[PDB]
Each structure stands twice: as C-alpha cells, then as structure tokens.
Design a protein around this ligand. Structure first.
Ligand SMILES: N[C@@H](Cc1conc1O)C(=O)O
Ligand SMILES: N[C@@H](Cc1conc1O)C(=O)O
Ligand SMILES: [Zn+2]
Ligand SMILES: [Zn+2]
Lengths: 258, 258
C-alpha cells in the first residue's frame, strides 16, 4: 500500500536538498511537487515513496520498439503507482495513462539570452542565425512535429534537420546552451520553467513573446487505477483552497533572486 | 440517439444569430460553443440538438432540497446528454457530473466602468461607495462564499448582506449594472467574459487587475456516461491542432469593435 511516486529532478518541482546525503527517503527532496505530493497523499490517505524516474525523461513512445520511456513508461509498465511532476497532459499520453484535471496551466514559450533580437516564434522562423531547439522528447517536441500552423511547421522543418542537434536531453542543458551561446541559441520550453529561470541568478535569460499554446500538467496514474478518482478530486479541492497558487508563489517568486 | 446538448445564452459562446427567427434548430445559434459542439460531434461521430438550459443558470445545489439547478441539474436529472458551455470545473460539480479536460482556462476577474477608482479586489474590500457583486449562483459566488482568504472573506461578508442585492441573475445583467451605475458598481466575473465585453461597443468597461484564481471550463456529461471518454479525447485533440485557439481568436478578437 505504500504508493510509489515517480517524478523527475526539474527545478523548482523536485530538487535535492543541500544535505540530502544525510537525510532519508522523502526527506532528501524539496520543491513544488514534493510539497504537492505530501498534500495529495494526506488528502487521499496514503503513504508514499518518491523515486526519480530512472531514464530522466518525461515520456514518449519509441517509434521502433513502441516502448514508452520516462515517467509515462514507469506508469504504463507498472513500476510506479502515480506520477507527480511537471508532466504535460496530451492526447497520446491520455490514451495510455489517466490524468487528473490540471494543477498548473502553461504554454510553450521562448527563452533567450538577454539582448537577443527575437520577439516571437515568427521572428525565429524568419531567420537562421540564431539556432533554436526543444527538449528531445516530450510534449514540446511533439507539438512542433505535429503542428500544422506554418510558423510552427517552418520551425519544425528547421529543427528536425539542424546540425549539430538543437535538441537537448534536459531542461538544464537547454538553459546552459542559451547562457553559453552569446545569443545564438534560443530555447523552446514551457512557460513555467522559463519564468522560473528568469528569476534565478545570473539573471541573464528572459521569456519573450506570448505562449505558443495552452495546456496543463496533471497528476498521472496507470489506466484504471484505484487512485485516480480521489487524486483528481484532491487537485480540485487544493486548487479551490488556494494551495496551488501558494506553492507557485513560494517556489517561483518568494525566493526569486532577480 | 440524437444527443441532447444543454448550453446557455452567454456571449460569445452561444448567441442567437441576427436572423434567427427564420432559421431552425441548431442553425439559430452561433458562437464559440456552437462551433465547438460541431467540432466535438464530428470527431465523436454523433448528431445533436442544441437546447438552451430552461432556467438560464449554470448550476448550483439548493442547500435545503439538495436539488441541482441549471445545466448541471439538466445533466444530473437526465434532461440532457452533454453540456457544451462556459461551464466551470469545480469540486462540487465534479462530484455529481463528469468533466472533460479543460477546453479553456480562465479566472475570476473584476469589471469596472472606465475611470472607476479600483485596481484590485483588495481595493474593493477597503471601501463602501462602490458596490460589487457576482452572478447569483455558479462557481464565482461559491468562490467568495468559500474563501479562507482574507480579502475575499471580507468581500463575501459585505456581498452576502449588502442590501439591495449586489448579485445578478445573468452576466448581461451584471454588465448592464456596471454600465448604468456611473462607476458605483463593479462586477466580479470570469476573465473570458470580461475580456470579451471589454472589446465590444460602447467600450465603456475594462478588466482591472489580475485574475483571482485559475481554473477552466470543461464539457460535462452525466456520471459514467458513454460519451465521457470520446469527448475528453476530442477536446485534447482539438486543443493540440490549434482549433481551440483558432475559435478563441475568431470569437474574441477578430471582430472586436474597440
Ligand atoms: N512538461 C513537458 C516537458 C518540458 C518541460 O519544459 N519544456 C518541456 O518541453 C513534458 O511533459 O514533456
Ligand atoms: N462559468 C461560471 C459562470 C460565470 C461566468 O462568468 N462569471 C461567472 O461567474 C459557472 O459555470 O458557474
Ligand atoms: Zn476538426
Ligand atoms: Zn431553496
């Protein structure tokens, strides 16, 4: 009955506490999703164990093997009971796992090194000098790959053929590339992460333009799991009681450094 | 077999076309939810009949009889098969009906007549010359009635006992009250309607401040319904293809008059 929670090391959702090495179990981690996991568990009445997804991914179906990787795979193949992370609710995922109503709203956004002469996706598409990419698996890449909006189709056409690769394995990798490229690389990531980074030292990046789309993160469970109903209701209750807005402010803005 | 769709006359979601008297059935109406209903039915493969909710309400439970009114009641008591409307996903409603994932995100906002000395809820709570209320039943009124947050708790106390009533029966009545009250009345309504009206003639109102919460509208079905699954998947598909964004620009800003 101890619920195995799969999640991912992604700031400020789940981060290692500075002393984690002298701590045990759930106490080793801190962050928005660590706080949310505690509350979901308390309102649903279950004991849980946080575990970091082994391959460090969000989740995508390999087109050859057709095997799901990341947190989605952990749920699909029975290695975890629930996923509490910045996991995007999408059609292909909803087809294999269950999602609660969203606990956070977001949209794909553009992250630039300050001073970059870019102001929108249209600007990125109309030039070639500043390279741009996305996480190499997950909802953002899939959004561009399936987009039929020309500004986005043009962007995908370029990204899928750019060399060296413009895709990165982790959010941190994308942010570092932005920071170390003197303005020649812009990163396409979720508004939530983009807004977070813009508030952290060295305060050299910023989110530009509006969001490209609109969607949410949901707490996921294995298709038909017994936890789904209570978890969904708990998210709604916690949102209505102001918990979610409080956690957003606590982890994004209250200890912002810029 | 023809699906009975319950919806509500609320601009620009569902409105009577100018020439509706000489039109019939579903053709009499136009709007975002009318376009959405057509997109959902096509993907889920069903024929439908649009019907305006009899009592003109969104849906709330009478504390004494425990009977649901509005579109929620029409689903609860079997008078309709699905509600395609700007119906807000809430915990009390989710307990009695099913909601698809969000097709639109929004938040409670403040509508003022241009030039009114108000910039936030807080601003409304610390004065008494400017009355302010909400729709008479629905998710907004509940929000203030259930607030564990100080500014808002203060707002319910004044609202619940103001006399005469600061509550209104329809969004239109709330908007008209703002407009003819020479700035002595502000109306609390969802950002979607607020932003919409703000872009319509006589262009004398405006949304002030930020949203008070974050939530969404969902397509609702009776508990356990055969349509729940397909509808939910259709919403996600429509969002990802950009149809939902397309419809929003179509009905909100493409014809704006200010
Ligand atoms: N939440 C996303 C991952 C993600 C995080 O930030 N940009 C992204 O693409 C997912 O679920 O793939
Ligand atoms: N969407 C709300 C109603 C509503 C619309 O605009 N302000 C409101 O309160 C509901 O479903 O009750
Ligand atoms: Zn379609
Ligand atoms: Zn009564």
């Amino acid at each position: 009955k101890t619920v195995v929670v799969t999640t991912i090391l992604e700031s400020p959702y789940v981060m290692m506490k500075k002393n984690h090495e002298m701590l045990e179990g759930n106490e080793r981690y801190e962050g928005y999703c660590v706080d949310l996991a505690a509350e979901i568990a308390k309102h649903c009445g279950f004991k849980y164990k946080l575990t970091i997804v082994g391959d460090g991914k969000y989740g995508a179906r390999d087109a050859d093997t057709k095997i799901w990787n990341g947190m989605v795979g952990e749920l699909v193949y029975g290695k975890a009971d629930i996923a509490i992370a910045p996991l995007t609710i999408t059609l292909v995922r909803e087809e294999v796992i269950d999602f609660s109503k969203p606990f956070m709203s977001l949209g794909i956004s553009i992250m630039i090194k300050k001073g970059t002469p870019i102001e929108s996706a249209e600007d990125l598409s109309k030039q070639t000098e500043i390279a741009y990419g996305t996480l190499d698996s997950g909802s953002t890449k899939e959004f561009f790959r399936r987009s039929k909006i020309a500004v986005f189709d043009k962007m995908w056409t370029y990204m899928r053929s750019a060399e060296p690769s413009v895709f990165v394995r982790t959010t941190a990798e994308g942010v570092a590339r932005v920071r170390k490229s003197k303005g020649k690389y812009a990163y396409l990531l979720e508004s939530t992460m983009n807004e977070y980074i813009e508030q952290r030292k060295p305060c050299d990046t910023m989110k530009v333009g509006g969001n490209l789309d609109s969607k949410g993160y949901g707490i996921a469970t294995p298709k038909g799991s017994s936890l789904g109903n209570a978890v969904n209701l708990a998210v709604l209750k916690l949102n209505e009681q102001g918990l979610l807005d409080k956690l957003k402010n606590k982890w994004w803005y209250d200890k912002g450094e810029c």
